[PDB]
């Protein structure tokens, strides 16, 4: 290992001693990758061992199995689990690959060359050789593009993926004719992030998702080649700090943004996160409650269209600020929700009064009731319901877990952008250790600020 | 230097000779913060009532409409808007924009931009003065909390109507409804936040008292001791060894913190970390995770429920819940 006397970094910053040790840095990164794959495999095995296909996935607190099921792999129409074996196969494969990666990390961390510059020039970066850093970026960018095209191939020629918008309760569909139109695909990124627009979180079709991943894979491969064969422009040299900690800070900012995006994706989106596996969203549960009570009071005579609430605004139906007919009550805040079980009841001007009277099918009612009883509300100790409950139900929605956890991770990695980026700037300038004490900048400035 | 006007402009913007440091983060902080200040002042003084709950029941929050400073507030945006973007040009008229709570959204957006650029500006001046750039990291904790109570919680709950009102009584209402719907007191992250503010107060008092006591005699009686210290003294005017000895003898020897640097890092890290944790707690509860729910957790041999203090807390929570929005609920479960 190392010591503080020869490095200047204490034990609580010991990995910082690896900044200029290329081989051991590679070993550490490979070991952490092996850790990631090991958690993937072990947690997948844990979930399948604790899984009963009779109950819905979101009832049993599973996060990885919904991810595998969204890709097909043993789900029938309506999100019914047919074979749990593919989940087991995925767990075993990720686990064994993790064993291999862990051995590799151990080797490259203990016995492998400490610095790769001399013996292995192909792997000998210098943290300031801009061409070499761009080459590494290009290699890993090509790998990412290949992964995106792998997803596209899975959806195209390998059984498709689980479309929750398919007629009926949703089913595994083979996506043909992906949305490869530039305007449609790039209109999401420039779309507003507010209500009704939702930025890229509001992607609703599988065709749009597959076309977008097509564009991203192609662009990532092309950009990998470009960043391989080119050196940053002279204006790029002046704009950025060129050090390992600087690159780390840039990546930290990027992945903090991605973590926030994933949190919002899990909370709001129900296309890439079908409610059959992840359970209803917040808006979905609220709309489901309103719909269930509407159909209950409509079955008991009454006329929900003319039913006036206590505020004089409409007990079951009202008009969105734009004019679209929407469910009344507080759920008017979620009027822009769209779900597989409510779209058939929507006409050109929103919810249709005629369809809401006779076109409702029993499966829609059952799904709405189930979503209402499993709203994404829970406690820290996994007690379902609002904060004022009887501590009888054991349920917290997987969407809530994903949203909370990855939001915390996104915030902490933004703090990482701040910390590691400021330190990169200071170290490049030379202030990393403190004021000069012989030539303070402030003492060279005119008084009174 | 360069005769170009752009170079002169960049020199002036980044100049450290300004009374207040403008920066590149400054050129976004100044307009957004000024816009937010103007709108907040004019709305707090004279703004018509706002239909916060979307039930056509406007709430008065301005001084001109019979409010004092304690009760006055800038009412959050209408629940009918939800998370929709509501700029002035979107509304048909200024009257409608005022009625639906547009000023709250305007102030919140321009203010969030302002505080982010304020943190960036703190970093920028640290870089320009040749100092370590981690005051912004400490300042991130208030920014995190403000984002949680103004942006993240509305996003999780699906409406800006659930954001904290820009007022005092509005703040208290937000706190009470939050406790009703999430049991924040039992959440371990408000626990860490409370420990953080109490520890901040304790350590501030402890450190200030120790430094003031250790202050070496450079000024005699008949005047304030502050005259002993000079702004350019460039020396420690207090005996650190005596203060460390006192603190060690007070509780137990070898209590560490003989380093001034270690002591000040601890002072920086305790409240900042705890405020980070409590802001994360607010955001996680915004995604409906809530605190511990030990209601009816204790039962006797036959099955009778034995009440606990958690049950009394639940009774108070029920009291808050059934009254927080009298007319906005048409169905038994809030869920929103």
């Amino acid at each position: 290992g190392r010591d503080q006397e020869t490095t200047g970094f204490a034990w609580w910053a010991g990995n910082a001693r690896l900044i200029n040790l290329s081989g051991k840095l590679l070993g550490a990164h490979v070991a952490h990758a092996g850790l990631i794959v090991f958690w993937a495999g072990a947690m997948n095995l844990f979930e399948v061992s604790h899984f009963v296909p009779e109950k819905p996935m979101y009832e049993q607190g599973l996060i990885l199995l919904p991810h595998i099921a969204t890709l097909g792999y043993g789900v029938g129409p309506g999100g019914e689990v047919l074979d749990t074996f593919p989940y087991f196969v995925s767990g075993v494969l990720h686990l064994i690959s993790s064993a291999v990666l862990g051995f590799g990390g151990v080797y490259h961390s203990l016995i492998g060359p400490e610095t790769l510059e001399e013996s292995y020039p192909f792997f000998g970066y210098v943290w300031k050789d801009k061409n070499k850093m761009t080459n590494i970026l290009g290699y890993h960018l090509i790998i990412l593009g290949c992964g995106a095209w792998l997803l596209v191939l899975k959806a195209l020629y390998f059984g498709g993926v689980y479309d929750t918008w398919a007629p009926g309760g949703g089913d595994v569909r083979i996506i043909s004719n992906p949305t490869t139109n530039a305007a449609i695909i790039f209109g999401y990124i420039v779309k507003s992030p507010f209500g009704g627009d939702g930025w890229i979180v509001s992607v609703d079709n599988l065709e749009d998702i597959i076309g977008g991943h097509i564009w991203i894979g192609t662009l990532c491969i092309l950009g990998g080649i470009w960043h391989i064969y080119t050196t940053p422009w002279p204006w790029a040299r002046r704009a950025f700090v060129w050090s390992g900690e600087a690159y780390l800070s840039y990546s930290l900012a990027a992945v903090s943004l991605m973590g926030f995006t994933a949190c919002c994706f899990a909370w709001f989106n129900n296309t890439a996160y079908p409610s059959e596996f992840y359970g209803p969203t917040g808006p979905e549960a609220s709309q489901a409650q309103a719909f269930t009570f509407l159909v209950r009071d409509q079955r008991l005579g009454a006329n929900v269209a003319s039913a006036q609430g206590p505020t004089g605004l409409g007990k079951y139906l009202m008009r969105s600020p734009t004019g679209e007919i929407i469910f009344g009550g507080e759920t008017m805040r979620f009027w822009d929700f769209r779900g597989p079980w409510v779209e058939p009841l929507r006409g050109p001007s929103g919810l249709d009064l005629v369809k809401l009277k006779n076109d409702i099918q029993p499966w829609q009612e059952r799904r709405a009731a189930e979503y209402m009883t499993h709203a994404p509300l829970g406690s820290l100790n996994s007690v379902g319901g609002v904060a004022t409950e009887i501590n009888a139900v054991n349920f917290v929605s997987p969407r809530s877990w994903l949203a909370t956890s990855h939001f915390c991770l996104g915030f902490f990695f933004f703090v990482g952008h701040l910390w590691h980026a400021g330190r990169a700037r200071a170290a490049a300038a030379g202030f990393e250790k403190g004021i000069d004490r012989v030539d303070e900048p402030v003492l060279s400035m005119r008084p009174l600020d | 230097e360069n005769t170009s006007l752009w170079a002169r402009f960049c020199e002036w913007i980044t100049s450290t000779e300004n009374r207040l440091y403008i920066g590149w983060f400054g050129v976004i902080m100044i307009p957004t913060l000024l816009t937010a200040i103007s709108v907040y002042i004019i709305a707090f003084i004279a703004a018509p009532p706002v239909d916060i709950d979307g039930i056509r029941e406007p709430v008065s929050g301005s001084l001109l409409y019979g409010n004092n400073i304690i009760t006055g507030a800038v009412v959050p945006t209408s629940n009918a808007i939800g998370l929709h973007f509501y700029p002035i040009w979107e509304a048909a008229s200024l009257d409608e924009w005022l009625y639906n709570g547009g000023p709250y959204q305007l102030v919140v957006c321009h203010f969030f931009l302002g505080v982010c650029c304020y943190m960036g500006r703190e970093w920028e001046l640290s870089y320009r003065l040749g100092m370590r750039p981690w005051i912004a990291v400490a300042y991130s904790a208030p920014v995190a909390a403000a984002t949680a109570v103004f942006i993240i919680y509305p996003i999780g709950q699906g409406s800006f109507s659930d954001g904290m009102p820009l007022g005092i009584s509005g703040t208290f209402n937000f706190m009470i409804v939050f406790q009703a719907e999430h049991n924040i007191l039992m959440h371990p992250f408000h626990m860490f936040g409370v420990a953080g503010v109490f520890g901040g107060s304790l350590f501030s008092a402890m450190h200030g008292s120790l430094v003031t006591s250790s202050l070496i005699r450079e000024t005699t009686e008949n005047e304030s001791a502050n005259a002993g210290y000079k702004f350019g003294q460039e020396e420690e005017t207090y005996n650190i060894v005596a203060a460390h000895g006192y603190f060690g003898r007070l509780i137990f020897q070898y209590a560490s913190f003989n380093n001034s640097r270690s002591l000040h890092f601890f002072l920086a890290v305790w409240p900042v970390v705890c405020i980070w944790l409590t802001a994360l707690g607010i955001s996680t509860m915004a995604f409906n995770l809530n605190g511990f729910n030990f209601n009816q957790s204790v039962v006797d041999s036959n099955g009778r429920v034995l009440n606990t203090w958690a049950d009394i807390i639940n009774r108070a929570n029920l009291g808050m819940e059934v009254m927080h929005e009298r007319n906005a609920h048409n169905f038994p479960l809030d869920l929103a």
């Binding site: 008084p447 009174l448 | 009374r19 003084i45 004092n68 400073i69 000079k230 702004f231």
Partner: peptide, 30 residues
């Protein structure tokens, strides 16, 4: 009339802040 008093108090506080910022006594080094 209460609104007038509240506005005056807020304006006074803001003016005091402005004077304490831009008309402060210079920090005398040594």
């Amino acid at each position: 009339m209460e609104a007038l008093v509240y506005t005056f108090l807020l304006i006074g506080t803001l003016g005091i802040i402005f004077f304490s910022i831009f008309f402060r006594e210079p920090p005398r080094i040594a």
